Design a protein around this ligand. Structure first.
Ligand SMILES: [K+]
Ligand SMILES: [K+]
Ligand SMILES: [K+]
Ligand SMILES: [K+]
Ligand SMILES: [K+]
Ligand SMILES: [K+]
Ligand SMILES: [K+]
Ligand SMILES: [K+]
Ligand SMILES: [K+]
Ligand SMILES: [K+]
Ligand SMILES: [K+]
Ligand SMILES: [Mg+2]
Ligand SMILES: [Mg+2]
Ligand SMILES: [Mg+2]
Ligand SMILES: [Mg+2]
Ligand SMILES: [Mg+2]
Ligand SMILES: [Mg+2]
Ligand SMILES: [Mg+2]
Ligand SMILES: [Mg+2]
Ligand SMILES: [Mg+2]
Ligand SMILES: [Mg+2]
Ligand SMILES: [Mg+2]
Ligand SMILES: [Mg+2]
Ligand SMILES: [Mg+2]
Ligand SMILES: [Mg+2]
Ligand SMILES: [Mg+2]
Ligand SMILES: [Mg+2]
Ligand SMILES: [Mg+2]
Ligand SMILES: [Mg+2]
Ligand SMILES: [Mg+2]
Ligand SMILES: [Mg+2]
Ligand SMILES: [Mg+2]
Ligand SMILES: [Mg+2]
Ligand SMILES: [Mg+2]
Ligand SMILES: [Mg+2]
Lengths: 101, 271, 88, 64, 55, 117
RNA sequence: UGAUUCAUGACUGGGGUGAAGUCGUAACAAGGUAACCGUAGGGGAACCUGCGGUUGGAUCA
RNA sequence: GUCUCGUAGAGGGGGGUAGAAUUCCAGGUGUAGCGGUGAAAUGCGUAGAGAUCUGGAGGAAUACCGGUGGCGAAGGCGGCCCCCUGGACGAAGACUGACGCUCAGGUGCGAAAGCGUGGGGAGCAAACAGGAUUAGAUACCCUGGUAGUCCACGCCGUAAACGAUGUCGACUUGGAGGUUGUGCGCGUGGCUUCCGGAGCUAACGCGUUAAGUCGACCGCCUGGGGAGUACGGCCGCA
RNA sequence: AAAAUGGCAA
């Protein structure tokens, strides 16, 4: 498996769905024998610049170790989910468990 | 695959064939076949109403499912088949309940692939959904113009439509012509492009190959006498008039669209 | 490049010991393993000329090692090419 | 170079407070010569800032 | 270069701050650089010449 | 003739000309003046003085609206960048903000070829 | 019936030489639009223009 | 030369994505100019331009970072993310045991322009048109503008494709830097910039990255024109 | 802004 750091931002009106979204995403990874090394919910934050005419978004950070295939499936889910305005998936050299800044 | 013939005869020199190894070599599925006798371009008054049609090979009609309304039931592609009635290839699909149907074969579709139709279908080539449920910017084909009517747009080999926008009960589509058109969001579309995009690379190579497809020769108006055609006449090659149809309408730029009823749906003409 | 586990397996199969990574047979077996693996890459990426230059170096290096082995010991050479399914 | 003194392995795109020091008011990345940042960290800093810009943690420009 | 005139600040002082901010941003230099296309060969030649002169 | 307390002055400072347009905060134009239209043609048109006069003429053009406070947006590298702003202050408008809005591509499109003179 | 070699042939291509001819002034200075290389298009002519490349470019107060 | 661990990198191929800007389209505000030059004019604008604001479309390129910086055999390679993948370097050991160097012919790669088929087309722009300038102006300057520039695939095979310096190895005073490892402020490796000693060189200069001192192998030269042309051959769609 | 040209001799 490989270590990926995933940051996704959700439309503020769909902030209520975020806890359910997180559980489903974590479930997919754990189902594939992946491990959730870090999970943080930053909550609604002020965007540096407007995205899709939105001035705020709900940020979620997760560090995960998983097969590349499950991560690809997660990226497709983000693409087809209207709530997820933006997402970033980055490979990491090692698992990160320390709290984010 | 596109294959140039070797020039072993003058009629073969320019021939370019599109050869698909995947296409079924056997006979079509008999329950979905109907006869379709030829018209010669003649109507029920027995008059030629479209010129240049006649002869060509005998062809059986394959009943193709343009509606794709068997929702919720997965189907597996058994085989791709040649269809003489259209430029696209067709796929024989088997539903889990044991029903077989033909569909337009999308690009990339192969035997063993699984397809589904309905609101809950996955966004994958060959799947059919209401365009309300299809993401904006998607490439689609076999697009209905009225909900439940059956696909009418983007059915020819290699064609597709783009869903450019969604507003209320209507989606805006970019057609192959380049026209921007509004259609009801409830109208169904199939994900992907129609397959057989190499269709347009074929080169018939000889007069006889057009005859096989039931195309009779076009005689140029200027080669006729005045009594036959506006362009007719002259001692030698002469012209000296604005180009027109055999019936006298200008045929180089004059627009003929006249449908106030459907004008509301046209966002932008092809230009 | 070849994984640590994949490399380690090959060394064991062709080497006298796990320490014997330097043997011609091991070297050729490692080269063959990567060449065969890269065939998939180059089928997908026909215009990856820069990577292919690396492949060609592997092919050349393998050829030189086989030529060395053949003159050094024909019997070892004959066994190796049979095991690796090499024409020569 | 703060990063060299700190002994940070990699500059973090999430660490906006640090990053804000190395961007101008316009939002442009500050040159290493002015900051005194080592080249290796300057490259890491640029990548981090670009990632932060994409996530809208930092502005590309002062007038979005 | 966005300058907000502070309370009890003279216009001239604020204007000088705007000029300074523009110079820091190097807005005018960027505009002059982009007025016409410089071939990469020309760009590389200029950069080398600057480095040699500085040395 | 709706009264607008707060307006935005847009200064288009080009090498050939200066255009001064005073708008409401929403960006609806209220009045405008140019160096070219202010009685300066040819070499005079591209001067700070001509830009100054344009600013004054624009201020006169928007006098009915009774604008008190102006936010200034400056665009372009032309000679009328600063003279216009000083003129607006001299006109008696309170300048709340001064901003440079000159467009800069982050690469963008290939510019025209270099002139050979 | 071919090959090859030599001679010759209306006319035609470019080359060289020769008056202080005719038309310009392309290059050498920043040669007055730096020059040149490859390529492409154009033009009575030297050449001009695009694209990329080189310094075997002058200037810097 | 192989293995183990790690490091830096615009190395390559594929896919996705972001922000800035230009153009276009639609609409709002607004009114007589705009644009352009040495100066003009062509052009655009009362059929409402330019300016300003909002929404949309589309293509191409990635400001700042940025560097006598880095990577690549050369050509070349620059937003960010993922996938596949080549090379280099360092440390401490282990392993193989001369397995090496060069290379006619051969084969592969090879900027830009160009060619073929199918796409795409914002900006730019050969050709072309008009306006200037001029004795003329088939130009330089201006307003426009098509191929092309972009993508896929195939062809072409050339450039001042340059360090005008073939590849590999050994040896021979220094100084100041850059960049990238590593051991314990002092060492020790890789790559790179400037300067300079002996020596070398017609001189200019080169100078441990040699154009010094040697060895291996290859390519090439033999006065200027005529000519890298003719003819023939081979290659190419041209 | 424009700004062309000038036999070979010794
Ligand atoms: K999404
Ligand atoms: K005909
Ligand atoms: K006729
Ligand atoms: K006739
Ligand atoms: K006749
Ligand atoms: K003859
Ligand atoms: K010239
Ligand atoms: K040229
Ligand atoms: K050899
Ligand atoms: K064009
Ligand atoms: K050689
Ligand atoms: Mg017909
Ligand atoms: Mg058919
Ligand atoms: Mg038919
Ligand atoms: Mg015809
Ligand atoms: Mg007749
Ligand atoms: Mg008639
Ligand atoms: Mg006649
Ligand atoms: Mg006539
Ligand atoms: Mg001259
Ligand atoms: Mg000249
Ligand atoms: Mg010159
Ligand atoms: Mg020209
Ligand atoms: Mg790599
Ligand atoms: Mg290098
Ligand atoms: Mg090209
Ligand atoms: Mg082409
Ligand atoms: Mg143009
Ligand atoms: Mg032009
Ligand atoms: Mg050559
Ligand atoms: Mg080069
Ligand atoms: Mg050479
Ligand atoms: Mg060699
Ligand atoms: Mg020296
Ligand atoms: Mg020749």
């Amino acid at each position: 498996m490989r270590h990926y750091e995933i940051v996704f931002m959700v439309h503020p009106d769909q902030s209520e769905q975020v806890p359910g979204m997180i559980e489903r995403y974590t479930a997919a990874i754990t189902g594939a024998e992946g491990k959730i090394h870090r999970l943080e919910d930053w909550g609604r934050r002020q965007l540096a610049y407007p995205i899709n005419k939105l001035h705020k978004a709900h940020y979620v950070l997760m560090n995960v170790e998983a097969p590349q295939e499950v991560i690809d499936e997660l990226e497709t889910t983000f693409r087809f989910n209207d709530a997820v305005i933006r997402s970033m998936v980055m490979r990491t050299k090692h698992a990160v468990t320390e709290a984010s800044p | 695959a596109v294959v140039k013939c070797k020039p072993t005869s003058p009629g073969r020199r320019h021939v370019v064939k599109v050869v698909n190894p995947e296409l079924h070599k056997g006979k079509p599925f008999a329950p979905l076949l109907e006869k379709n006798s030829k018209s010669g371009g003649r109507n029920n008054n027995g008059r030629i109403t479209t010129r240049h049609i006649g002869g060509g090979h005998k062809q059986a009609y394959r009943i193709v499912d343009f509606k794709r309304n068997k929702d919720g039931i997965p189907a597996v592609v058994e085989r791709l088949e040649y269809d003489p009635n259209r430029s696209a290839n067709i796929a024989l699909v088997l539903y889990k309940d044991g029903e077989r149907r033909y569909i337009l074969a999308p690009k990339g579709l192969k035997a063993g692939d699984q397809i589904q139709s309905g609101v809950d279908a996955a966004i994958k080539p060959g799947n059919t959904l209401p365009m309300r449920n299809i993401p904006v910017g998607s490439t689609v084909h076999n697009v209905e113009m009225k909900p439940g009517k059956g696909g009418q747009l983007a059915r020819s080999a290699g064609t597709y439509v783009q869903i450019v926008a969604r507003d209320g009960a209507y989606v805006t589509l970019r057609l192959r012509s380049g026209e921007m058109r509004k259609v009801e969001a409830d109208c169904r579309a199939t994900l992907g492009e129609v397959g057989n995009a190499e269709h347009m690379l074929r080169v018939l190579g000889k007069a006889g190959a057009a005859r096989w497809r039931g195309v009779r020769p076009t005689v140029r108006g200027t080669a006729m006498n005045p009594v036959d055609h506006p362009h007719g006449g002259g001692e030698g090659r002469n012209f000296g008039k604005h180009p027109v149809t055999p019936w006298g309408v200008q045929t180089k730029g004059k627009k003929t669209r006249s449908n106030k009823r459907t004008d509301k749906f046209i966002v932008r003409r092809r230009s | 490049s070849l994984s640590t586990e994949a490399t380690a397996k090959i060394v064991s199969e062709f080497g006298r010991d796990a320490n014997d990574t330097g043997s011609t047979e091991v070297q050729v077996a490692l080269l063959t393993a990567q060449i065969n693996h890269l065939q998939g890459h180059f089928a997908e990426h026909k215009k990856d000329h820069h990577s292919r230059r690396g492949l060609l170096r592997m092919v050349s290096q393998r050829r030189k090692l086989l030529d060395y082995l053949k003159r050094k010991d024909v019997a070892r050479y004959t066994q190796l090419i049979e095991r690796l399914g090499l024409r020569r | 170079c703060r990063f060299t003194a700190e002994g940070v392995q990699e500059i973090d795109y999430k660490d906006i407070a640090t990053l804000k020091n190395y961007i101008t008011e316009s939002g442009k990345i500050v040159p290493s010569r002015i900051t005194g940042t080592r080249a290796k960290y300057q490259r890491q800093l640029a990548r981090a800032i670009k990632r932060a810009r994409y996530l809208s943690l930092l502005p590309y420009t002062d007038r979005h | 270069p966005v300058i907000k005139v502070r309370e009890n600040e003279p216009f001239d002082v604020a204007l000088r701050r705007f000029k300074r901010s523009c110079e820091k941003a190097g807005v005018l230099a960027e505009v002059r650089r982009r007025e016409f296309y410089e071939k990469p060969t020309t760009e590389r030649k200029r950069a080398k010449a600057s480095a040699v002169k500085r040395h | 003739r709706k009264q607008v307390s707060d307006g935005v002055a847009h200064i288009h400072a080009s090498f050939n000309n200066t255009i001064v347009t005073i708008t409401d905060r929403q960006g609806n134009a209220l009045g405008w003046a140019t160096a070219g239209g202010s009685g300066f043609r040819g070499s005079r048109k591209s001067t700070p003085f001509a830009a100054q006069v344009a600013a004054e003429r624009c201020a006169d053009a928007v006098k009915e609206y009774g604008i008190k406070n102006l936010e200034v947006m400056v665009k372009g590298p032309g000679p009328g960048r600063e003279s216009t702003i000083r003129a607006l202050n001299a006109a008696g408008f309170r300048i709340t903000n001064i901003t440079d809005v000159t467009p800069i591509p982050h690469x963008g499109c290939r510019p025209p070829k270099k002139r050979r003179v």
